[PDB]
C-alpha cells in the first residue's frame, strides 16, 4: 500500500463557530490503483484532497505515505517531497498571469539538471499530445476557458510524477477531449506504475476508473470494486447507485 489514512478529521473555524466537514474518513489506496471519489456537492472533497496531500494541515488523525509519517515533519522536507512527486491538477485553474503557457508548463521541470534541447523536445511531445499547440506564446488572459484546463492538466505530466492528484479534470471539456484526457491518464497508470486519484461528478469519467468511492456528509457510504467486469456493466451500476442516492 502507499496511502494509509486512520480517523482523519478537519474543521474550519475562527474560534467562534467550528463547523465540521470531514468525520472519520479511512482509505487504503494501493499501488497502481485508479481510485475515484464522487458524491454530493457540499461535502468535503477538495478539502479531502488537500488534507490527504501536504498542501494543508489536519486536526485529528494520522496519514502514512511510503512508510514514513507526517507528524513531526517540518515545512522544508515536506516542500521538498511535494516538489519531487505529487503532481497536482487544481480546480480554480491555478496559472500564473505574469508568464506564458510554455513557461507555465516547463517551470516544474527546471529543478535538477535538465538541458534546453531535452526540455524543448519534451514540451513539444506533451503539447501536441494534448492539443495546446500554437498557444505557446499567449498569456493566460488571451486564451479560452477550456484551454486553461488543458494547460493545467498538461503541467503535471511533464516531470514524471509518482502520484497524481486530480480535481475534476473534465470540467469544461466536451466528450472527445475528456475521452482523450482520460485515455492518457489510464495509459500513464497502466504502462508505468503510478497511482492516480481523481474526483469528478460525471459518471462517464468514473467509468474508466477501477474503484469508485461515494462520500456523503463526511462519511464512507458504499464502495464499489468493479473487478472482472466490462465498462458498460460498471457504468450502469454507477448510474443505478447514484439514482439510489
Amino acid at each position: 500500500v502507499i496511502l494509509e489514512a486512520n480517523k482523519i478529521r478537519k474543521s474550519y473555524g475562527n474560534k467562534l463557530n467550528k463547523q465540521e466537514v470531514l468525520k472519520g474518513i479511512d482509505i487504503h489506496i494501493e499501488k497502481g490503483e485508479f481510485v475515484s471519489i464522487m458524491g454530493a456537492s457540499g461535502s468535503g472533497k477538495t478539502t479531502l484532497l488537500n488534507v490527504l496531500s501536504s498542501i494543508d494541515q489536519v486536526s485529528h488523525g494520522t496519514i502514512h505515505i511510503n512508510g514514513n509519517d507526517m507528524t513531526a515533519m517540518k515545512e522544508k522536507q515536506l516542500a521538498e517531497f511535494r516538489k519531487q512527486h505529487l503532481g497536482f491538477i487544481f480546480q480554480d485553474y491555478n496559472l500564473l498571469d505574469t508568464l506564458t503557457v510554455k513557461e507555465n508548463i516547463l517551470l516544474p521541470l527546471s529543478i535538477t539538471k535538465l538541458s534546453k534541447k531535452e526540455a524543448n523536445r519534451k514540451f513539444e511531445e506533451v503539447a501536441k499530445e494534448l492539443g495546446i499547440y500554437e498557444l505557446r506564446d499567449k498569456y493566460p488572459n488571451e486564451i479560452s476557458g477550456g484551454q486553461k484546463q488543458r494547460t493545467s492538466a498538461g503541467r503535471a505530466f511533464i516531470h514524471d510524477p509518482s502520484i497524481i492528484f486530480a480535481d475534476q479534470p473534465t470540467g469544461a471539456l466536451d466528450s472527445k477531449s475528456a475521452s482523450d484526457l482520460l485515455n492518457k491518464l489510464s495509459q500513464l497508470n497502466q504502462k508505468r506504475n503510478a497511482t492516480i486519484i481523481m474526483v469528478t461528478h460525471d459518471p462517464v469519467a468514473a467509468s474508466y476508473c477501477g474503484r469508485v468511492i461515494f462520500i456523503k456528509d463526511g462519511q464512507m457510504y458504499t464502495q464499489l470494486n468493479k473487478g472482472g467486469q466490462d465498462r458498460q456493466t460498471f457504468f450502469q451500476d454507477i448510474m443505478k447507485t447514484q439514482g439510489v442516492l
Binding site: 516542500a79 517531497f81 505529487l86 505574469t98 516547463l106
Partner: protein
C-alpha cells in the same frame, strides 16, 4: 442605496484607501513648509540682489510641477486598482455620468479632508527641523518661522487648481474604456511590444544626449554671459528641465530593451530565480519609468543641499584656522611676554616658536598656467615672504632649490601652478635664481605677512645667510616676527581664550575662536536655508521610498501562494527577490550620485573654499542610510513571504 454599498466596500478595502491619503498628506506637508520658508521677513535681505532672486523664481515652479506629477500618478494608480466596480455598475444599468458624479463626490470629500489634515503636518515638521538646526548644529541666523496668512492662500489656490486636472484624468479614463476591458485590466500586461524594437535604443540615446548637454550648460553658469536677473532664471529653468526629461527618457527606453534582449535569447525556460526578478519588472515597466525619476530627483536634491551646507561649515572652520596660522598669534613681543607670564601661573605650558620673515618680491610668471587677464597684481611683481630652513621641523631643502607652502584649494582655480621650473628672485643689486621643487600642505605665516593671500617660500639656510644680511628695506613691515602660541590636546581652551581677550586691551592680536565665530555668523542665512531645504527633502525622499515598498508588496501577494504550493521552499523564494531589490536600489542611487556630483561642482566657490574634503564625506553617510533602508526592505519581504500560505 449606493452609499451604503460604497461604505460597506470601504470597510473591507482599507489598504488601498490608506495609500492615497498618505500621499495627499505628505505632498501638502512639503509644499506648505517650502512656502512658509519663502514668506518670512528675515529673508528680504537675501531677496532682490541679482543671483538670489532668480532661485526663487525657478524653485516656485519646480516644486509645483513635482507635486502635481506625483499626485496625478498616485490618483491614476488608485483608480486603476479597483476598475471592477465600475464595470459591474455599468453592467447593472448605471450610465457613465452617474459613475463620474459618484467618483467626483467621493474624491472631493477625501481630497479636501486630506488637504485640511496636511497643513497641520507641515507646520510640525518645519518647527522640528528648525529646532534641530538651532540646537544640535549651533548656528546663528536670528530667523523665526511664523504661521503667516499668505501661505494658506498660496497652498489652497494651487491644490484647488490641481483638482481640475485630477477630474479631467478620471473623466477621460471613464470615457475611454469598454464594459469588458475593465474586468481584466487588473491582470493585463503593459509591455505591448514583445520585440526588440531598436527605437527604444534611439530614445535612450536622446535621453543621454539631453542629460549631457544639461551638464555642459550647467558647467558654465556662473562667471559667464549671464548677468541680468532675467538671464539666470532662463538658464536655471533650461538646465533643471533638460536633466529631468533626459532621465525620464533614459529610463523608459533602456529597460524595455535590455529586458527584451535577455528574455528573447532564452527561448523560455525560466527556472525559479528569474520568475520573481525579470517577469515582475517586465509586467510593470511602464508604471515604474516615472516613479524612479521622482526618486532620483529628490535624492539628488537632498544630497546637493546637504553637501553645500557642509561645504559652507567646513570651509568657514578651515579658513578661521588658516587666517591665524597657529592657535594664538601676536603682533609685538611685549604682549606675548604678558600672555606667557599669565599662563605661567595657569599651570598650562606653551610652545613658543620664533620665525623671522624677509618680505621680498619674486617672479613666478613662467610657472603660472593661467592667463594675463587675471592680473591679481603686476605679472612680474608678486609680493612674497621668505623664511629660512631651520625654522621648519618637517623638511630640509637643499641648496639651489625653492619650495612653496600652503594649499588653499580655491587658489588652484585662478593662479594655476605648473611643474618644476625656475623662479627669479630680484634684490637690490643682485640676481639669485632658484628652481621650484614642490608645494607643501601647511601655512607658516599669518595673513598680515601673506599680502594678498599667496603663501610663503622656504629656502636653504645657506642662501638665507646672505639674504637676511642684504635685507632690502623698501617693502618691509614694522617688524619681522611670527611669535605664536601652541597648546596640547583638548583642554580648557576657552579659559586660555578668555585670558587672551583680557590681555589685549586694544584687541590688536589675532585669535582662533573669535575668527571662527565671526565667519560662522557672517554666513548664517546662507548655511541655514540650504540645511532646512535639504532636511525637508530628505524626509520626503524617505517617505516616498517607504510608500512604494508597501504598494508593490501588496500588489503581487497572490503569486507567492501559488509557487509555494507546487513545492518551492520559503528559503528559495527569498533568493529571487534580492536581485529585484538590488536593481531597484542600485539604479537610482548611482544616477542621483552622478547628478549631485555635477551639480555641486558648478556651484561652489560661492559658499566656501573647500570641496573634495566635505563632498566625499557627505555622500558616504547617505549611501550607508540608503543601504540600511534596502536591507530593511528585504527583511520586510521575507516576513511577507513567510505568511503567504
Amino acid at each position: 442605496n449606493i452609499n451604503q454599498l460604497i461604505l460597506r466596500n470601504l470597510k473591507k478595502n482599507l489598504r488601498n484607501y490608506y495609500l492615497y491619503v498618505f500621499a495627499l498628506i505628505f505632498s501638502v506637508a512639503l509644499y506648505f513648509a517650502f512656502v512658509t520658508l519663502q514668506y518670512d521677513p528675515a529673508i528680504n535681505e537675501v531677496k532682490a540682489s541679482i543671483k538670489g532672486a532668480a532661485a526663487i523664481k525657478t524653485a516656485s515652479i519646480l516644486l509645483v510641477a513635482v507635486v502635481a506629477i506625483f499626485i496625478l500618478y498616485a490618483n491614476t494608480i488608485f483608480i486603476k486598482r479597483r476598475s471592477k466596480e465600475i464595470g459591474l455598475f455599468q453592467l447593472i444599468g448605471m450610465t457613465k455620468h452617474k459613475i463620474f458624479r459618484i467618483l467626483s463626490a467621493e474624491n472631493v470629500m477625501l481630497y479636501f479632508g486630506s488637504l485640511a489634515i496636511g497643513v497641520a503636518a507641515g507646520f510640525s515638521i518645519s518647527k522640528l527641523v528648525l529646532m534641530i538646526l538651532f540646537k544640535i548644529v549651533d548656528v546663528k541666523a536670528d530667523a523665526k518661522l511664523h504661521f503667516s496668512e499668505q501661505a494658506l492662500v498660496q497652498t489652497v489656490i494651487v491644490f484647488c487648481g490641481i483638482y481640475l486636472l485630477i477630474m479631467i484624468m478620471n473623466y477621460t479614463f471613464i470615457k475611454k474604456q469598454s464594459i469588458l476591458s475593465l474586468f481584466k485590466v487588473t491582470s493585463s500586461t503593459e509591455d505591448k511590444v514583445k520585440k526588440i524594437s531598436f527605437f527604444q535604443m534611439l530614445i535612450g540615446a536622446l535621453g543621454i544626449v539631453l542629460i549631457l548637454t544639461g551638464y555642459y550648460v550647467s558647467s558654465e553658469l556662473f562667471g559667464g554671459k549671464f548677468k541680468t536677473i532675467n538671464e539666470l532664471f532662463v538658464a536655471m529653468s533650461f538646465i533643471l528641465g533638460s536633466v529631468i526629461i533626459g532621465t525620464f527618457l533614459f529610463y523608459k527606453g533602456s529597460v524595455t530593451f535590455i529586458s527584451n534582449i535577455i528574455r528573447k535569447s532564452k527561448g523560455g525556460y525560466l527556472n525559479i530565480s528569474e520568475v520573481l526578478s525579470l517577469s515582475s519588472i517586465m509586467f510593470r515597466m511602464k508604471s515604474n519609468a516615472l516613479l524612479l525619476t521622482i526618486i532620483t530627483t529628490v535624492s539628488a536634491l537632498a544630497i546637493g543641499l546637504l553637501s553645500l551646507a557642509y561645504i559652507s561649515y567646513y570651509s568657514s572652520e578651515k579658513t578661521a584656522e588658516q587666517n591665524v596660522a597657529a592657535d594664538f598669534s601676536f603682533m609685538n613681543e611685549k604682549d606675548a611676554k604678558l600672555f606667557e607670564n599669565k599662563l605661567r601661573e595657569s599651570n598650562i605650558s606653551f610652545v613658543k616658536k620664533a620665525t623671522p620673515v624677509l618680505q621680498a618680491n619674486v617672479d613666478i610668471a613662467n610657472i603660472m598656467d593661467g592667463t594675463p587677464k587675471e592680473m591679481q597684481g603686476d605679472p612680474g611683481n608678486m609680493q612674497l615672504a621668505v623664511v629660512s630652513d631651520k625654522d621648519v621641523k618637517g623638511v630640509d631643502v637643499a641648496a639651489g632649490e625653492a619650495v612653496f607652502s600652503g594649499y588653499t584649494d580655491l587658489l588652484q582655480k585662478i593662479m594655476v601652478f605648473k611643474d618644476s621650473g625656475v623662479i627669479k628672485v630680484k634684490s637690490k643689486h643682485e640676481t639669485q635664481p632658484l628652481k621650484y621643487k614642490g608645494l607643501r600642505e601647511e601655512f607658516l605665516v599669518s595673513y598680515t605677512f601673506t599680502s594678498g593671500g599667496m603663501p610663503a617660500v622656504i629656502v636653504d639656510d645657506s642662501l638665507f645667510k646672505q639674504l637676511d644680511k642684504d635685507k632690502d628695506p623698501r617693502i618691509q613691515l614694522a617688524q619681522s616676527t611670527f611669535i605664536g602660541v601652541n597648546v596640547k590636546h583638548d583642554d580648557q581652551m576657552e579659559k586660555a581664550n578668555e585670558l587672551f581677550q583680557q590681555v589685549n586691551k586694544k584687541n590688536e592680536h589675532l585669535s582662533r575662536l573669535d575668527t571662527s565665530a565671526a565667519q560662522k555668523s557672517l554666513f548664517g542665512m546662507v548655511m541655514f536655508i540650504v540645511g532646512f531645504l535639504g532636511l525637508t527633502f530628505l524626509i520626503t525622499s524617505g517617505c516616498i521610498l517607504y510608500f512604494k515598498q508597501m504598494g508593490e508588496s501588496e500588489d503581487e501577494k497572490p503569486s507567492y501562494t501559488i509557487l509555494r504550493k507546487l513545492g518551492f521552499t520559503q528559503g528559495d523564494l527569498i533568493k529571487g527577490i534580492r536581485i529585484k531589490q538590488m536593481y531597484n536600489f542600485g539604479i537610482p542611487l548611482v544616477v542621483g550620485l552622478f547628478h549631485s556630483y555635477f551639480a555641486v561642482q558648478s556651484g561652489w566657490f560661492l559658499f566656501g573654499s573647500e570641496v573634495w574634503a566635505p563632498m566625499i564625506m557627505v555622500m558616504v553617510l547617505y549611501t550607508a542610510l540608503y543601504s540600511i533602508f534596502g536591507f530593511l526592505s528585504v527583511l520586510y519581504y521575507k516576513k511577507v513571504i513567510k505568511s503567504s500560505l
